[PDB]
Coordinates of C-alpha atoms and ligand atoms in Angstrom, one line a residue:
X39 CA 42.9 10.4 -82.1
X40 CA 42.6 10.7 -78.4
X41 CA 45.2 12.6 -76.6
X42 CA 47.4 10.8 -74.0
X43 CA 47.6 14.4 -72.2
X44 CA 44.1 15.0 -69.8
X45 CA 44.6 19.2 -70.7
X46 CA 44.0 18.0 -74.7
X47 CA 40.9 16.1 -73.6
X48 CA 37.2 17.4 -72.6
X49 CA 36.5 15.7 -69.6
X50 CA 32.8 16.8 -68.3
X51 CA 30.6 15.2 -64.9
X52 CA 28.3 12.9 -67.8
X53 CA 31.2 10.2 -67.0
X54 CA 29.4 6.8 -69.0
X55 CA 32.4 4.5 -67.8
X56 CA 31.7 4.8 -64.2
X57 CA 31.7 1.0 -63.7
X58 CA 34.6 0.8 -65.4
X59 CA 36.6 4.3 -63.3
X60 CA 35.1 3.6 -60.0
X61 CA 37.2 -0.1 -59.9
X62 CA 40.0 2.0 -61.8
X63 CA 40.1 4.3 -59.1
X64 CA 39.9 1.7 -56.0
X65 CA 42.7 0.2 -57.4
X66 CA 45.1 3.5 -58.3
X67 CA 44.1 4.4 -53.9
X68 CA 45.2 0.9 -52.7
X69 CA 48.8 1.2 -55.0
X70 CA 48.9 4.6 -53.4
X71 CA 48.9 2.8 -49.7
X72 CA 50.9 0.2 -50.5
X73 CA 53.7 3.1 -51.9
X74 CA 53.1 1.4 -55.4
X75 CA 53.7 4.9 -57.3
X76 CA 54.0 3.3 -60.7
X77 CA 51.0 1.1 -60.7
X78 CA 49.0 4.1 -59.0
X79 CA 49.7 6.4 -61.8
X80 CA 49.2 3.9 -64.6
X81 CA 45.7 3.4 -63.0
X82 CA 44.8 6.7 -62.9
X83 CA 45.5 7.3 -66.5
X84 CA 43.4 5.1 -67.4
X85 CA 40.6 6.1 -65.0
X86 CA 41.0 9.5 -66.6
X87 CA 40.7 8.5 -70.2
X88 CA 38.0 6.5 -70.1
X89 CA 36.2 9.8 -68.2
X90 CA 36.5 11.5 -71.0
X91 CA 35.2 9.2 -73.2
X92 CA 31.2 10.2 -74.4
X93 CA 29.7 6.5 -74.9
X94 CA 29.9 3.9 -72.1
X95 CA 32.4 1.0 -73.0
X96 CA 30.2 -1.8 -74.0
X97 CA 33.1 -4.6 -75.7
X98 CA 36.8 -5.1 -75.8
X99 CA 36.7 -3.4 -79.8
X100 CA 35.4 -0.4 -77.9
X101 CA 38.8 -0.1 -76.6
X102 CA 41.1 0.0 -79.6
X103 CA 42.4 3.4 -80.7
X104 CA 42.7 4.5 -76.6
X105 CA 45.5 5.7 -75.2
X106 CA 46.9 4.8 -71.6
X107 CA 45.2 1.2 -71.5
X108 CA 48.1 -1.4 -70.5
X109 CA 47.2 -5.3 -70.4
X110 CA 46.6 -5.0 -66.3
X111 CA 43.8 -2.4 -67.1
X112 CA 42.4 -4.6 -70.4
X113 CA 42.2 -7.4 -67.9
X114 CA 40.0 -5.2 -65.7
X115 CA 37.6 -4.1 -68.4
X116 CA 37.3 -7.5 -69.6
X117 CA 36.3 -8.7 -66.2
X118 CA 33.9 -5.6 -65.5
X119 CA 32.5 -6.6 -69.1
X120 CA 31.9 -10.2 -68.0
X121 CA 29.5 -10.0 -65.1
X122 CA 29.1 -6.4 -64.2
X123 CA 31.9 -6.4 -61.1
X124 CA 35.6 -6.3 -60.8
X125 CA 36.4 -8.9 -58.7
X126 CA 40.1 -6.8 -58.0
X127 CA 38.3 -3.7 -57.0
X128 CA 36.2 -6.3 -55.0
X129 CA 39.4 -7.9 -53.1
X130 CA 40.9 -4.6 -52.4
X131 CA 37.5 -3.0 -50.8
X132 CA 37.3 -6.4 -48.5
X133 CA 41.1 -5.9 -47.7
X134 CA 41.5 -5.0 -43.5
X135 CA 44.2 -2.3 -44.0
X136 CA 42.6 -0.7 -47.4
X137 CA 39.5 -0.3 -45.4
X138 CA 41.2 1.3 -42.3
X139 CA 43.2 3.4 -44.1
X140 CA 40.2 5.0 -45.7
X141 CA 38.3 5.0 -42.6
X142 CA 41.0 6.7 -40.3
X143 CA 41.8 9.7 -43.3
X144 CA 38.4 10.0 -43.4
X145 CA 39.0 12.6 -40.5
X146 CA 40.6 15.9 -41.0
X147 CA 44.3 15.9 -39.9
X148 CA 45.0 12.3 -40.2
X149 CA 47.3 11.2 -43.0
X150 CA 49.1 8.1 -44.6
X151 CA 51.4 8.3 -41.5
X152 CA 49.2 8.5 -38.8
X153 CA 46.9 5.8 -40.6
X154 CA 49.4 3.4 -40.7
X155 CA 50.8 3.5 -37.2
X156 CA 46.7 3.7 -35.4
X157 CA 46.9 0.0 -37.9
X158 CA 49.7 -1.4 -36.7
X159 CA 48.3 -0.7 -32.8
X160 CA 45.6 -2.9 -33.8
X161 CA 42.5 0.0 -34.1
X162 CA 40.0 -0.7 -36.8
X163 CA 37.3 1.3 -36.2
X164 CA 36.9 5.7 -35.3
X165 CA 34.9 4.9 -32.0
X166 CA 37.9 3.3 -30.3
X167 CA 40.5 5.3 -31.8
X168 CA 38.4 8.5 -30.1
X169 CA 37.7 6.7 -26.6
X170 CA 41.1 5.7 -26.2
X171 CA 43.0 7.6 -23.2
X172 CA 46.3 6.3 -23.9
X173 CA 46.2 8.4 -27.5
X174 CA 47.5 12.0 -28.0
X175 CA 46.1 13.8 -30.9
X176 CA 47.0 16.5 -32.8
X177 CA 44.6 20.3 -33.1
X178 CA 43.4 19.5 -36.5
X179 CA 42.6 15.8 -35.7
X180 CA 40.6 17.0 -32.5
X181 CA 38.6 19.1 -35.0
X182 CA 38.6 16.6 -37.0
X183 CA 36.9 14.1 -34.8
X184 CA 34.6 16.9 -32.7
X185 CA 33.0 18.4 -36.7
X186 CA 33.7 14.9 -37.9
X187 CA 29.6 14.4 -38.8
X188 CA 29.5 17.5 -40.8
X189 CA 33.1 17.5 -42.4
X190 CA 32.4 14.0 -43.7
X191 CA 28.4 14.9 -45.4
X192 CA 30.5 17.0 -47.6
X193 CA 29.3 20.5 -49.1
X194 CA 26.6 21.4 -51.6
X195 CA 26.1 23.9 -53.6
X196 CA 23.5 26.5 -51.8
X197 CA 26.1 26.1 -49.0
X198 CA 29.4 26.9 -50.7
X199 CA 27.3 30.1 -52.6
X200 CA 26.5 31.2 -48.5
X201 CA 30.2 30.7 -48.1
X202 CA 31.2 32.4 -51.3
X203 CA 29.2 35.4 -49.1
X204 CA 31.0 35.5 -46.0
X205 CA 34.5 35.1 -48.0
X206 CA 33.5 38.5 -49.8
X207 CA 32.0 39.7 -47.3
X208 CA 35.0 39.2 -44.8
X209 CA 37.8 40.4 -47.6
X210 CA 36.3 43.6 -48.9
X211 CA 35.9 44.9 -45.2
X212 CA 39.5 44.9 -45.0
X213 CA 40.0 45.2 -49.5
X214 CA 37.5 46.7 -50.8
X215 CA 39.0 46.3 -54.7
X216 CA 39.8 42.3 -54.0
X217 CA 38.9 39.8 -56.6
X218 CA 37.4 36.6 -54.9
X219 CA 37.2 33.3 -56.8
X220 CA 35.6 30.0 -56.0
X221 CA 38.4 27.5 -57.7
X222 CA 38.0 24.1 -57.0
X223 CA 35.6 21.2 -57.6
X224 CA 32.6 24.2 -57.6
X225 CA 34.3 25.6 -60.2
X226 CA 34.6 22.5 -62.4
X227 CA 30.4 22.1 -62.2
X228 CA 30.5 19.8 -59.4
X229 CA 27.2 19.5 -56.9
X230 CA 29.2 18.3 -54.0
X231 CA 32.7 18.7 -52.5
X232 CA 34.8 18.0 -49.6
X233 CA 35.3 21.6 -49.2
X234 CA 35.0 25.1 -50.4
X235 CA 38.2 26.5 -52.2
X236 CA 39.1 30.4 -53.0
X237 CA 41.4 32.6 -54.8
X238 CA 41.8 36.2 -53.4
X239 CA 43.5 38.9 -55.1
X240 CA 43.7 42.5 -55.1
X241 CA 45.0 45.0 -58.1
X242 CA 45.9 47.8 -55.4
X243 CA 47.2 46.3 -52.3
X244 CA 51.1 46.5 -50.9
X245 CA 53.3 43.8 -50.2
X246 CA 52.6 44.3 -46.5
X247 CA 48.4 44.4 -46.9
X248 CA 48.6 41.2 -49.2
X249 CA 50.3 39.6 -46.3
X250 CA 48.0 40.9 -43.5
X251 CA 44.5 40.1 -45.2
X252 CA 43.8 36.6 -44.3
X253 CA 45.3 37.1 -40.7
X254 CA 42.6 40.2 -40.2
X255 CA 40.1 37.8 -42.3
X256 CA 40.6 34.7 -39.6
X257 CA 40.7 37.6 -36.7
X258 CA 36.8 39.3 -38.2
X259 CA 35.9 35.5 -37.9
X260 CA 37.2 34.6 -34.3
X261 CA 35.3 37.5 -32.8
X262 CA 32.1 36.6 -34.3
X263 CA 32.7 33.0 -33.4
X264 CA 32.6 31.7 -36.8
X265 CA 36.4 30.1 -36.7
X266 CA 36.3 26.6 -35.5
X267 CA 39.6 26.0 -36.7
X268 CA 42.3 27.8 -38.4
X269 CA 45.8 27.3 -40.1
X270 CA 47.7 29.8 -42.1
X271 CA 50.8 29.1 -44.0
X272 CA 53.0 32.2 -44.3
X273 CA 54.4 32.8 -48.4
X274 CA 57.5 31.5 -49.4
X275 CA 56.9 33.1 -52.8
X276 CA 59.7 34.3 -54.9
X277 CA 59.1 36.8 -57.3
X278 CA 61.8 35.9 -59.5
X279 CA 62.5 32.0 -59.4
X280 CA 62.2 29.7 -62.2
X281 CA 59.0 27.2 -61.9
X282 CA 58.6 23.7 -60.6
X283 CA 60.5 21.1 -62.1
X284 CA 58.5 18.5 -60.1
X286 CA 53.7 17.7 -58.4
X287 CA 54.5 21.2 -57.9
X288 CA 54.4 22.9 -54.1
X289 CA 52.4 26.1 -54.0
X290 CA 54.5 28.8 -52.3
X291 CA 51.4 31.7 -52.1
X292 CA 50.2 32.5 -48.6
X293 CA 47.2 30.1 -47.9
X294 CA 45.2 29.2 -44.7
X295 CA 43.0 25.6 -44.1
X296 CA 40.1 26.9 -41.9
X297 CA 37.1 25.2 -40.4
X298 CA 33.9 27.7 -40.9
X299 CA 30.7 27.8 -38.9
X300 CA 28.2 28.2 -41.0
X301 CA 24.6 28.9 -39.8
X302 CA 21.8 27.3 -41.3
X303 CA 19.4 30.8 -42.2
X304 CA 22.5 31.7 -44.7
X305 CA 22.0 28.6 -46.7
X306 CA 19.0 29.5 -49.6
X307 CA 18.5 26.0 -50.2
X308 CA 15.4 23.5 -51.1
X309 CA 15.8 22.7 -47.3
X315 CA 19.1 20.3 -35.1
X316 CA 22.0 22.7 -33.7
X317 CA 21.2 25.2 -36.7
X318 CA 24.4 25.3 -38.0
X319 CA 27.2 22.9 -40.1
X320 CA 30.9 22.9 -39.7
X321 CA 32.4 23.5 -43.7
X322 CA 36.0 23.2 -44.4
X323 CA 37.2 26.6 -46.6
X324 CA 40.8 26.7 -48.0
X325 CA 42.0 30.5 -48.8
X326 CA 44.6 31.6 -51.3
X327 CA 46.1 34.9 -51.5
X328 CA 48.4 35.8 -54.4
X329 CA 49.9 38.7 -56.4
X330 CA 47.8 40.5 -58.8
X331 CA 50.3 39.6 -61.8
X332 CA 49.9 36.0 -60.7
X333 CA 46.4 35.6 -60.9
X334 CA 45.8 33.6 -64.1
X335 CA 48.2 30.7 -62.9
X336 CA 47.2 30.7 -59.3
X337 CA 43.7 30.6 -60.8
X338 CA 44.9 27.5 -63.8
X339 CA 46.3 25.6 -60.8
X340 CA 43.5 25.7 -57.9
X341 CA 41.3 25.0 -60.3
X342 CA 42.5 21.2 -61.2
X343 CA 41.8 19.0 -61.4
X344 CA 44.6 17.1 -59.8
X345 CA 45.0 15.1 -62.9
X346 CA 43.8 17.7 -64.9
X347 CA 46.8 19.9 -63.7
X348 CA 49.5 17.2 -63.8
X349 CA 49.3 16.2 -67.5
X350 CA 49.2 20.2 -68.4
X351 CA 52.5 20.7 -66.1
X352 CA 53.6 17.2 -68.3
X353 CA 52.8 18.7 -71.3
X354 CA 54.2 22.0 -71.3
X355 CA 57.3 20.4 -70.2
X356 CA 57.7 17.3 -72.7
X357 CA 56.1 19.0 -75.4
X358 CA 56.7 22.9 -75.5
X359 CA 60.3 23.1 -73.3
X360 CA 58.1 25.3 -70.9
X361 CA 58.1 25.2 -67.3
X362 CA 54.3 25.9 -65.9
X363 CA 53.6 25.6 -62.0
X364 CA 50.7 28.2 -59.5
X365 CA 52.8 30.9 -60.1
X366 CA 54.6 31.5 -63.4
X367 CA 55.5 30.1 -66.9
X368 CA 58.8 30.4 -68.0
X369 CA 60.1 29.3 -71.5
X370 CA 63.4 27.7 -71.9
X371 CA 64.1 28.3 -76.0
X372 CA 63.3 32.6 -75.4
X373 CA 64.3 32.4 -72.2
X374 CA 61.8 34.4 -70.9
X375 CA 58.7 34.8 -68.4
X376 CA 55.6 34.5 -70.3
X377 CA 52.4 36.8 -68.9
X378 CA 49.1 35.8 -68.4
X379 CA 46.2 38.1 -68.0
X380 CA 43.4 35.5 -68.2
X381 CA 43.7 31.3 -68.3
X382 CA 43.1 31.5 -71.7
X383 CA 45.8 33.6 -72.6
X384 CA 48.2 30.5 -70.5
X385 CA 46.5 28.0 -72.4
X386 CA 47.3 29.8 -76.0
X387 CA 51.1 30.1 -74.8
X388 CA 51.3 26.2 -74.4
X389 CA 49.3 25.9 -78.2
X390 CA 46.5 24.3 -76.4
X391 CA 42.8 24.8 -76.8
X392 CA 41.0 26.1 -74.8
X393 CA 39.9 24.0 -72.1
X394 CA 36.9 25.2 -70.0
X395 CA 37.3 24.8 -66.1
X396 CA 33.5 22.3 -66.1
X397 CA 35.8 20.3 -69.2
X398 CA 38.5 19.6 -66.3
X399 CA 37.0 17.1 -64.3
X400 CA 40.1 14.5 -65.4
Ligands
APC1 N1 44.2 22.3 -49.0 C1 44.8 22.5 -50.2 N2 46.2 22.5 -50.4 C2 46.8 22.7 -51.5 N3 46.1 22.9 -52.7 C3 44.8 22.9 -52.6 C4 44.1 22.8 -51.4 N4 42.7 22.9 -51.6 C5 42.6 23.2 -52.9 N5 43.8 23.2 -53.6 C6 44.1 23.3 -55.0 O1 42.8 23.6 -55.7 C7 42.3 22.4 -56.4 C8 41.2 21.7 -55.6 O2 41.8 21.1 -54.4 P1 41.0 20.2 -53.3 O3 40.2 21.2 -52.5 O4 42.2 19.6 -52.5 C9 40.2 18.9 -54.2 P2 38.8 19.5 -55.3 O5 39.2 19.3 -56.8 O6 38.5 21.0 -55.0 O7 37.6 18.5 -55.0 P3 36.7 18.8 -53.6 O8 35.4 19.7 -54.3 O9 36.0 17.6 -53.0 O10 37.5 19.5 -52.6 C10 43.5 21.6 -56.7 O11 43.9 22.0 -58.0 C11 44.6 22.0 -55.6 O12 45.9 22.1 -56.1
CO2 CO1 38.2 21.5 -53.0
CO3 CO1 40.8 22.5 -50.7
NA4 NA1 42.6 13.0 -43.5

């Protein structure tokens, strides 16, 4: 029997339902516009069952005996079943706002927010949101729109490997025993991404030295003229509290950067000789690593239905940096995923078996 829980399922990138997902997932964004929280999530379980599933849906009997498939989503199969297309999916990627919402957050600092009000002023397309000299923008949305080309042809794998170099490269100048980790998409098997995610951790460093690294990092890139942009979020980690009740906030030190990366670093099969590549950074404490690791890895669903489940199921409390049990009343260590996954009396679940 199929697990209603996405962290007792074996989700891999051979997805046969994509007909059925892609429509799925159209629909789950446009509930997440219209503030449709409910609908979006139902969507979206569905989406992520059906991704698990290792024969392509073919009839309506192929359904029975699946979990998190409502009427609304039958209705959908059985229109995708008919003729190929969901004529919902259709309506929804022919709809004026839908399509400038996705447009206008295709750009790197723009939100739900921002979105919303360029709509409302009556801009539909990036070319006369940019020439307008009435607009103010933000510093991430100006690098947004100046790196906008390479930011948006996403990242492949010979490119986040030569990123994966100048990370370690960068860190053990300054840590020479730090652990670096590519989390993310890359770690779940995926050829492509939106950007290049890492975990950094060191067994020996201080309090102080844990806090300085990705501010001397950022610094070693500024003078070689490799930072095109740069944001780091201070810690708010506490050593101490009990984890997320909630989507959990991560409170480890963390920095959104905008790389340059030159094209003769890129080993590859293949104009200014160089691509603009969004990296995120994580630094966290060496007895923190497994869950910081568990949780950057995701997916997003991936990781919501494991926080679910250890809630719901086991009384535990799981979030990026600790798992607390609420019968013992105690802390629960972790030196390996693993080891997390055998506390919460789950398989294991490998990180390319994530993809939820
Ligand atoms: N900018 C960011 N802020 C907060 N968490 C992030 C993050 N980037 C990565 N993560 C964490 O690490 C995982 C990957 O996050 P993202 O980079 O946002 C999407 P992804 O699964 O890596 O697909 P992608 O390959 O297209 O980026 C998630 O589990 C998320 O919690
Ligand atoms: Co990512
Ligand atoms: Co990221
Ligand atoms: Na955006």
């Amino acid at each position: 029997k199929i697990s209603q829980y996405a962290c007792q399922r074996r989700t891999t990138l051979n997805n046969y339902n994509q007909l059925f997902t892609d429509a799925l997932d159209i629909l789950a964004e446009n509930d997440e516009l219209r503030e449709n929280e409910g609908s979006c999530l139902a969507f979206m379980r569905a989406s992520s069952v059906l991704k698990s599933l290792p024969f392509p849906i073919t009839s309506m009997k192929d359904t029975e005996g699946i979990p998190c498939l409502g009427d609304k989503v039958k209705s959908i199969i059985e229109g995708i079943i008919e003729d190929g297309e969901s004529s919902e999916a259709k309506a929804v990627l022919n709809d004026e706002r839908y399509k400038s919402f996705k447009l206008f957050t295709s750009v790197f600092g723009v939100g739900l927010k921002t979105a919303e009000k360029w709509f409302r002023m009556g801009f539909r397309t990036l070319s006369k949101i940019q020439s307008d000299k009435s607009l103010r923008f933000t510093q991430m949305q100006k690098a947004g729109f100046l790196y906008y080309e390479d930011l948006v042809s996403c990242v492949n794998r010979p490119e986040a490997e030569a990123v994966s170099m100048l990370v370690k490269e960068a860190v053990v100048t300054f840590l020479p025993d730090a652990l670096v980790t590519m989390t993310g998409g890359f770690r779940r098997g995926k050829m492509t991404g939106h950007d290049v995610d890492f975990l950094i951790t060191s067994p020996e460093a201080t309090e102080d030295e844990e806090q300085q690294l990705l501010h001397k990092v950022t610094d070693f890139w500024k003078q070689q003229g490799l930072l095109l942009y740069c944001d780091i979020l201070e810690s708010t980690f506490e050593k101490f509290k009990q984890p997320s009740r909630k989507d959990a906030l991560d409170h480890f030190q963390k920095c959104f950067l905008i790389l340059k990366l030159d094209h003769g670093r890129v080993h590859s099969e293949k104009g200014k000789g160089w691509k603009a590549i969004r990296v995120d950074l994580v630094m966290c404490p060496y007895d923190r690593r497994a869950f910081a690791l568990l949780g950057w890895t995701g997916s997003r669903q991936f990781e919501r239905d494991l926080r679910r489940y250890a809630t719901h199921e086991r009384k535990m409390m799981l979030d990026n940096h600790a798992l607390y049990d609420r019968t013992k009343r105690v802390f629960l260590e972790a030196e390996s995923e693993e080891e997390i996954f055998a506390h919460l009396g789950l398989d294991y679940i490998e990180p390319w078996e994530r993809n939820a």
